[PDB]
């Protein structure tokens, strides 16, 4: 119980994929002729990330070889992966024939159940306070190549003897050959890890198909007779890594400067790029004969499924101080602990070991440092308030062995407290009003507050705005949400909506709907606010959108909405996150 | 708290690449007809180096098998790499056709999105006080080769029997062959680590393309009919190691002599050599038939992006002493510590554990050595000033067990101090004016001061000049800066500029601009000094430079510029670094 | 602080390569017609060896399984390599054409930038006192070979049926083949480590090219049309190990007998064998047609660059005793230590822990052995001088626990010393004139004296001569130095020079010039002695040397030249080394 501190918690990422989200044209050549059908059954995304916050050094260690910095770790390894990604259980096909007269054109088209074209994962920093330190894999694949050069020559002499009715013959023949060939050999994987770093704050890992990446390459036939009609996609070539179940492996480790303060958000985008398979047959008619050839379609439609979860980290968190905090508890009272406010006034409140402000770090020099703000220390010169920390002899404390008398190094006096009010003070000996007994114990301030889900799509610029004093939210509402903000002058987004105000007090849940807007793009279209008392109110319209998805955010009891994060470009809002506390 | 000391700090290297810097001719054969367009979108350079300073032996260890020397380490490994280098997210292409009629010439030309021809990293020593000790990789690739010699002979006898209307025939035929072929096999990588050591002070690592290094080799076709028009660069061959994201891995460890003093700088240069891809088509017209052949262009333009960061190391730094310094603190006062000036006078100042002059090293013999200058020691014969260190018996100190009385080995007397002035003295026993209590603690003098950025390009000879007493910076400026200096006689650079004077007092920030000068080469063109008052000032002109890049330098509050580093050859200034404090 | 002792120090080997030394004829067939040009730009040699001196057993350990011997280690490993060897940064070429009429001869010749034909490293022992113990690699490569014998037979029967206007035919044909081939497979490296051991005192390591070792093998073409004119050397085949940067890996470990005394020098030769590449084209004219063939030149010129560095080891050094020396210090005085002269008289001088004569080794039996000469011991029978060591009971000492009274085992008396003169003596109790307090401490006698550089070339027999009483150096002056020596009768070398005399007193620096002598070979040509007065002095002439190289030697202030090492055979002087102090 003297090693590094750690804060660990999970992020569950769940997003069911509706069958309607998997609706695609039953044919690529004949879109409007034959209609549409689902391509994935009960698709689901379920991963479980692990988050670790840790300072790279213990508090008070000077001269260590590992640079002093604050480390945020987001990882997936053997110890925690999650259910995976699912799209189907087995691949079937429906065959389509030419309705019109076909002689020199395509006349048969095949639809193959959906496969995962590529898995995409995105990590984003909310501001510039964080930087990317190291990643796993450390690099993209640095392929190894093998070459061969084969050369040589061949000599041959031929002796032939023929006897027939015509007469004896004789042939002596000579041959001289030369050969030369160059070989090339390299390894490719079924899925290739493509690392992508847009800038110092964001790095994205893309599992992309490399082998069998084209509908062209999935065929096991090239030409066949006209009367042979069979499924030409050798489905054994599609490995179960593509449609059955997949799980990634990645590590990202952010760092923050030594004295960075404030806040920073992290966004984790898990996404699978669904792409059905289309294969068509080509009929060729020339004078001499008739045959049939196949082709592969490459520019078939692709639809992307996105689910996002975020979590907030404060650099002022106690864990980043790198020590194991303890509290000073006055033993005269049944339950009284020393607590420090923002300005440094010392009072004795009710003990609550999960409250950061009541924790102190015990260093090598014997000083007590306030856990929530490492620049304030306990000083014996004026014990009614904390003081700036320095090398003063009056700020060192030692425990007398075998008892609980807390002593001051400088003057030899002890630490004492009022038996009734909790005021600290220095005393050489006890009396009927001052007790010297003080007890210390380790505290649990390493809980991580859970993070609220995100609603919508996480694209474009992100803004952060605090809720106003009136606790009312301004929404510009039309066919889709135009803008959001805490005041009528702080709207970011559209202008065609209807101005209104919705009370955020007592909100029991929020129902957000997002999807493909009728005019274009993906937008947030509908928000339904339900209160714990039972009344409801709805803004926006739910009837001008297709491929909609429903996300729900249930506030725990007795909470107040405090911050609004707005995902919006110049036109419309694509996402919004409601923080608590 | 007893092992080797270490000083560690990070270097962040960020440099956004403007789209303008990525502008290239849309075609190589037809420059002026078709124009230009960007070739890389949102390119960025972001690496994070780790710097370690350490002495290879602890202080006071004699005759250890590792030679005594001072070690400076600059490295990138799995523990810290950074975001990497980015140029594009996927490679597109635009196709171009012949505007005029072509019969036997090139008539189709292709432009491929930019790829990284080679990555380059450069390390430079500022003077000859440092040498390169070891590097990783230790050596270039020492390829292994495999040879085969295949030889043999073949015999064949043929019996032929024919029956026809002409008559029965009979043929007995003999063959005898000889074969010989020689094989060659070797391994090549997609990128080949080329180590380059210009001299003992500078070594550079060049990641260079080896396989698929020519626009010739990227083609998957050689000949095709005139009517077939498709993109002929098999883009699957370009591995994601070239354009998506790349991260190096190398170590450089410098060494400095045992008693070297003064200062020495290091320069770290990250550079990615952007090179677009050009492919052309050849139409051949001969009498018998008509066909089309491809070619690869090798002399395509290349443009180099450079970002440089530096840091300064003083061989007199406390960490290079190889011990863990402590300080002697007088206990009578609340806050008084022993401090030594330049000449060795001893006075009691305010304690500041980060001040090097107040730190002392505790060796094996029991001597106290001043950490700031290891040639001075504490001596009991004349305790008001430090003396040259030797084997004198009066320079050894031992702590009395269970108390804090500092004793002298020679006479048995103790260490004493004035209760009011802090004057040291020898006393056999205490009194009302002299107290014997002294307290010791470990000190944090291992912080590393942050390093100022470099403005411009780091090429040519480098000069270092102290800021003058008047705090005036002389700039001989024209279209670009001709020279810089601290006095009218110490201008290094050109002479065609008009002499001027800019005051360096109260500089709040510096705006530097660099790029390709109109006449030739890459120069520094304009500097805009911002004062805390709010007034600005301009030297040079920004109207005669293309492909310019902008860098900014923000000084901390209340600081004085003290050193000027000038990058300039005989003609013009290529870069300048403003050291602080 | 009880394990093996060690002495470690670095040897820096720096040698700039002038562009003039890289001058070669621009063509091989046409020497005088075309002229000459540089072939290497900014070439440099920079390695850093590590030297370790150690005795294989701790002092006093009897019968250990490792044989008792003195070990000298010279090595290069991953922990210390140096910058490497550099010749060029990229390989360019210049093309030459025939100025005269060429029908059946060469008509085009190519010059390729220089590459390192072979790297060479040489270790020499100065006398027979040292032998080679083990080396890394332990042996040359013991190649592994793979053989295959392929044999078999093939049968074939052919049935042919023809219908034509002539009439139906029928053929039944039989074939029977036999095959046999033998394979051979072996591995070769781009550079092959060739170990070379001339005698027991000298072993040399030669990195020699094995694959692509001939200008013949560098060609990727054999025949081509007369109108095709392109560079025919496939430059990709030249691995960056040859011209970019190279670093060796070797270990040499000398041993010396148990009681060897005197001195011995070691010579370390680093040399890179520069060799340009020449390729020519062959035009062949025969009646039927005309074609062009290539050839490889093998007898191309080679020029060798040599840099030598040496260091001196004395077997009488304290470290070779294999213990950790300590010293006896009298506590009555402020600063007095026991010191032993050449003959063994004991006097109390000023302590200097780096002086070998004041160190003593503490063995298992409790004897004190003088570190400077392990045959002398401290004895209590006659305590004013050291005695030959044996098993006498009066030569054992034990410390009384808890105090510093040094006791004698035999009589029970203590070690005593005069309070004023430092004379040792035996006493049972103290008085006003004799004090018993003695203090012991570890000493730093493991510093290694710096080694002086070598001027010139290290070839031929080596001689060593002490500087005479007059401190005058005899030089035979001509076009080059004929001989050197400390007296007119002690000249080693030639006799054709003019006799002269030069003073060696107050020499602040020496300027040595060496290179290719006009008459033949490589000689030392000129020496310019610089005094403290600033005036110079010239012996020899600089007008008879081409491709000369300049080496410099700067002495420390207030130094005396004491030994002359002369590198010269019977004709002329090739090198000279001036030992310092």
TrEMBL record, chains A, B, C:
GO CC annotation: extracellular region
* Keyword list, A-Z: Signal
Give the organism the record lists: Vibrio cholerae
Protein name, UniProt field:
HlyA
Q: State whether keyword Signal applies.
A: yes
Q: Tell which residues of the whole protein are contained here.
A: 161 to 741 of 741
Domain named Ricin B lectin is located at 324-439
Query: Which superkingdom, per the lineage?
Result: Bacteria
Its taxonomic path starts at: Bacteria, Pseudomonadati, Pseudomonadota, Gammaproteobacteria, Vibrionales
Kindly state a single biological-process term from the GO annotations of this entry: cytolysis in another organism
């Amino acid at each position: 119980t003297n090693t590094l501190p750690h804060v660990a918690f999970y992020i569950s990422v769940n997003r069911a994929i509706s069958d309607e989200e998997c609706t695609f044209n039953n044919s690529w050549l004949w879109k409007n002729e034959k209609g549409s059908r689902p391509f994935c059954k009960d698709a689901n995304i379920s991963l479980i990330y692990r988050v670790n916050l840790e300072r790279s050094l213990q508090y008070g260690i000077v001269g260590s070889a590992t640079p002093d910095a604050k480390i945020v770790r987001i990882s997936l390894d053997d110890d925690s992966t999650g259910a995976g990604i699912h799209l189907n259980d087995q691949l079937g096909y429906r065959q389509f024939g030419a309705s019109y007269t076909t002689l020199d054109a395509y006349f048969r088209e095949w639809s193959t159940d959906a496969i995962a074209q590529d898995y995409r994962f995105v990590f984003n920093a909310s501001n510039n306070k964080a930087q990317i330190l190291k990643t796993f894999p450390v690099d993209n694949i640095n392929e190894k190549f093998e070459r061969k050069e084969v050369s040589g020559f061949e000599l041959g002499v031929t002796g032939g003897v023929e006897v027939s009715g015509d007469g004896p013959k004789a042939k002596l023949e000579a041959r001289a050959s030369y050969t030369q060939s160059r070989w090339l050999t390299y390894n490719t994987q079924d899925y290739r890890i493509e690392r992508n770093a847009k800038n110092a704050q964001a790095v994205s890992f893309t599992w992309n198909r490399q082998q069998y990446a084209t509908a062209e390459s999935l065929l096991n036939r090239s030409t066949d007779a006209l009367w042979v009609n069979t499924y030409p996609v050798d489905v054994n070539r599609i490995s179960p890594l593509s449609y059955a179940s997949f799980v990634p492996k990645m590590d990202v480790i952010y760092k923050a400067s030594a004295t960075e303060t404030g806040s920073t958000d992290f966004i984790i985008d898990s996404s699978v790029n669904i792409r059905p398979i289309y294969n068509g047959a080509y009929k060729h008619y020339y004078v001499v004969g008739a045959h049939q050839s196949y082709h592969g379609f490459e520019d078939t439609p692709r639809r992307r499924i996105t689910k996002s979860a975020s979590f907030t980290v404060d650099w002022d968190h106690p864990v980043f101080t790198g020590g194991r905090p303890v509290n000073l508890q006055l033993a005269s009272f049944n339950n009284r602990c020393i607590q420090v406010d923002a300005q440094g006034r010392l009072t004795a409140n009710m003990c609550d070991s999960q409250q950061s402000a009541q924790s102190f770090i015990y260093d090598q020099l014997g000083r007590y440092v306030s856990a929530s703000n490492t620049k304030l220390c306990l000083d014996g010169a004026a014990l009614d308030a904390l003081q700036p920390c320095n090398q003063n002899l009056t700020q060192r404390w030692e425990w007398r062995k075998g008892t609980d008398e807390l002593t001051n190094v400088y003057s030899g006096e002890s630490l004492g407290h009022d038996k009734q009010t909790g005021e600290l003070g220095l005393y050489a000996s006890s009396n009927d009003a001052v007790s010297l007994r003080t007890i210390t114990a380790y505290t649990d301030v390493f809980n991580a507050q859970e993070s609220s889900p995100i609603l919508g799509y996480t694209q474009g610029k992100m803004n952060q705005q605090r809720v106003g004093q009136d606790n009312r939210l301004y929404v510009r509402a039309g066919a889709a949400i135009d803008a959001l903000g805490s005041a009528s002058d702080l709207l970011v987004g559209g202008n065609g909506g209807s101005l209104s105000s919705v009370d955020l007090s007592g909100v029991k849940s929020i129902t957000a709907t997002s999807g493909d807007f009728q005019y274009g793009g993906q937008q947030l279209v509908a928000l339904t606010f339900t209160y714990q008392d039972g009344r409801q109110q709805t803004v926006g319209s739910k009837a001008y959108v297709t491929n909609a998805h429903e996300d729900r955010f249930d506030l725990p009891d007795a909470a107040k909405i405090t911050q609004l994060k707005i995902w919006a470009d110049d036109w419309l809002v694509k996402g919004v996150q409601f923080d608590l506390n």
